[PDB]
Design a binder for this molecule. Structure first.
Ligand code: QUI
Ligand code: QUI
Length: 8
DNA sequence: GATATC
DNA sequence: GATATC
């Protein structure tokens, strides 16, 4: 759920 | 480092 | 299960 390097 | 909503 | 980036 975090949106950092992936954004899910 | 830099992590939480589906 | 469902994950990558400066
Ligand atoms: C988002 O809350 C979150 C938490 N754990 C994960 C594990 C693997 C892929 C994506 C994820 N997203
Ligand atoms: C993004 O590429 C990425 C990869 N690994 C992580 C681990 C912990 C927090 C954030 C992250 N972001």
């Amino acid at each position: 759920x975090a949106x950092v390097x992936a954004x899910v």
